[PDB]
Amino acid sequence: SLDSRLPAFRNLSPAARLDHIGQLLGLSHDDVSLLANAGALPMDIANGMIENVIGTFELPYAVASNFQINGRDVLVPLVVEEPSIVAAASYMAKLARANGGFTTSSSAPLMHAQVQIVGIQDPLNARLSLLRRKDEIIELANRKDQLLNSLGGGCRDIEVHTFADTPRGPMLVAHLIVDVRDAMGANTVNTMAEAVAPLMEAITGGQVRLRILSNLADLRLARAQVRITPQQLETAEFSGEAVIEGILDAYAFAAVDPYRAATHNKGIMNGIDPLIVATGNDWRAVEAGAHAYACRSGHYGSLTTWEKDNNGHLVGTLEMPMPVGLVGGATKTHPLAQLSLRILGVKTAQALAEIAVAVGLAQNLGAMRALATEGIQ
Amino acid sequence: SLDSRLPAFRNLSPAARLDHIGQLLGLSHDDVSLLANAGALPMDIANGMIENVIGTFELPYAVASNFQINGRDVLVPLVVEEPSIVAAASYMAKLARANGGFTTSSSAPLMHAQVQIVGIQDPLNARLSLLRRKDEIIELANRKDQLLNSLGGGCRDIEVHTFADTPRGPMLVAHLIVDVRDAMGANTVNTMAEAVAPLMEAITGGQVRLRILSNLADLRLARAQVRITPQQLETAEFSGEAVIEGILDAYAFAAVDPYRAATHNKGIMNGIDPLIVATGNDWRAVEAGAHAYACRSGHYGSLTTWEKDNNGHLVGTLEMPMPVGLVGGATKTHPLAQLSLRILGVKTAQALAEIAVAVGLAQNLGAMRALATEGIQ
Ligand SMILES: CC(C)(COP(=O)(O)OP(=O)(O)OC[C@H]1O[C@@H](n2cnc3c(N)ncnc32)[C@H](O)[C@@H]1OP(=O)(O)O)[C@@H](O)C(=O)NCCC(=O)NCCS[C@@H](O)C[C@@](C)(O)CC(=O)O
Ligand SMILES: C[C@](O)(CC(=O)O)CC(O)O
């Protein structure tokens, strides 16, 4: 159906760009008019969104072209201040289309709720007392949020970890594992963590302290793949084969050197965070999950991978935590976050997460390609 | 002197808040008009900032109250979508004022430019060749930006790192260490890395690949301290002494468990990134430097520290990379970034960096204090 190629888009006026988007999507007049004039976020909404509001602050709102996800073309809205990002994403997506576009998958939308318990004399024994009573705790967690349960989410499981060696004594930390459906999940799981805390306290005999989600959302992973052939990467100076080898050298550099990995992953987030902003979502949560995950091994490394396959084609992956929502907060109340969701066509939060990692992978590829092909001056 | 306490700000309308800010600072009618009306970022500017622009996207623009930095009251603009951030930062700043406010310092604005060298069988020897000729390399770097040197910046040093055994062969990586004065520094140091590459090839006999800044800006540190007394933290349910103990428990939990540290550090960036956005700065760069620094030890831990001093008072620190500019990127392009810098009063980029880490420290304190008393919900 949709054709995201957007021929000539980069050279069109903003008004003509918006008209072409509107035709492809069948946008209503009200939708297009959200960009007829500045001020689409009414001040009454802005004033209800955060505290001490005195006005609004604009960033450019753009659409990356050419993206295709599991064979379906998609248009990607992005909000950011920095040049080259949107063009690089668009151009790498153009190259990806020739080899099948981006292929994506994701896990269920599972989030951790931590419950921290201090002052237990026998924490290792208390862990087993909690695990034996897992079903009772899960049932309690699922008591209140009737809507979530009806929609196919809810607390699925508990894990319990112990930290024997802290300067503040031993700590037991229970994790509720919660399917949050189309929410990012923080209010859902924080509510459950506060709800089960008295019962955990009764089972363990400790004092509950923190009841709080984890932003290291490593059970809520999204995955993207891309493939590029050497003919597509040939430049005036370098064969495509040589460019592929240069990109592999750049990847190996990021995998060994944290000073490079930080910059390399920053480029991924140049692609991802503007889509988070465009959909009214929390970009600090996505950033923290991204970079903490990059150093889960004890070494801060690259979130993407880059290889050559047995045909000599460049293949990239991005697998990372990606907690986002279609509901909640500004995603619902900002008229342009709703328009962004309309432009994307996503029907679940995990579908939005899959587009996010495709854009992050495309952005990293574009950044590496530029650096690997620039002549010595 | 300016008074940042902003009486009843929480309950004034956006218009009345803006009028009061304008009166405190002596803003002109035309400056106040930039926030009183939508559209301060005109489309010809937005269309020139990034590619494929179709419009602009607003976030609320707020001011946190009560902040005081090295004895001087400071108004802090913040652009973000999530509720309770601005309120919690203002609340914690209120408490800090009673004990001297926030005390800050920072290093010189030093940034790394990486120059990756491949193609030689003797990287360990080539590193010494580069160090032997380091003055010649530094002089060439500095010939490329005479204005920066006159402004008191420039390349100060080089350091060279080797990776003799990678899966892609031997590499060595030179770092130019560059004082970038009031810029974030990326374009400034990339230019120097390009300029020295041919000399580094001549010295080493190798091939230069990547020439690029590092976002792990660990020579560009900003520092903040805060102190809170137990009487300030007493609640109806908890003695202030008990709250202090509970905050130390929360800190120890972040220091041992990355699932908590990621969330703890996310709470810091809730305060920092909105100031970065409000000043037209690159928040992906600040995020990447923050989270990579947090795992420099081989364990992803807390950016802040929390302790109790000899008087029983709670004392907090935040020391972290903080690469921001007053010039460069979009700092000058966005009329409201310029207005933010006027509201802040900052005259150097390191002064902005110091305010950023004070806000981050305040934000973390606010999150932990709520989690250690009634809970975040
Ligand atoms: C502040 C609260 C939201 C409510 O305050 P309250 O009711 O207790 O006391 P109050 O006597 O009424 O007000 C005390 C002072 O607060 C300011 N103030 C109060 N309300 C105001 C308002 N509406 N407008 C303006 N200024 C207001 C104002 O300065 C006021 O002073 P005032 O006397 O008026 O001159 C508090 O619950 C509090 O901090 N909660 C913590 C919230 C928090 O951290 N959010 C972070 C985001 S979540 C997540 O992304 C991060 C994380 C948690 O996961 C991170 C992690 O896990 O680590
Ligand atoms: C090219 C960039 O530095 C990413 C990278 O180096 O891979 C990102 C840009 O914002 O500077």
Curated annotation (Swiss-Prot), chains A, B:
Keyword set, alphabetical order: NAD, Oxidoreductase
Source taxon at top rank: Bacteria
Expression induction: Coinduction with mevalonate transport system.
Enzyme Commission identifier(s): 1.1.1.88
Gene Ontology biological process: coenzyme A metabolic process
Gene3D superfamilies: 1.10.8.660, 3-hydroxy-3-methylglutaryl-coenzyme A Reductase, Chain A, domain 2
Catalytic residues identified in the record: E82, K266, D282
MF annotations from Gene Ontology: hydroxymethylglutaryl-CoA reductase (NADH) activity; hydroxymethylglutaryl-CoA reductase (NADPH) activity
Coiled-coil segments: none
Pathway(s) annotated for this protein in UniProt: Metabolic intermediate metabolism; (R)-mevalonate degradation; (S)-3-hydroxy-3-methylglutaryl-CoA from (R)-mevalonate: step 1/1
Reaction equations catalysed: (R)-mevalonate + 2 NAD(+) + CoA = (3S)-3-hydroxy-3-methylglutaryl-CoA + 2 NADH + 2 H(+)
Family under the similarity heading: Belongs to the HMG-CoA reductase family.
Role according to the record: P.mevalonii can use mevalonate as sole carbon source. With this enzyme mevalonate is deacetylated to HMG-CoA.
Protein name listed in UniProt: 3-hydroxy-3-methylglutaryl-coenzyme A reductase
Organism placement in taxonomy: Bacteria, Pseudomonadati, Pseudomonadota, Gammaproteobacteria, Pseudomonadales
Gene this protein is translated from: mvaA
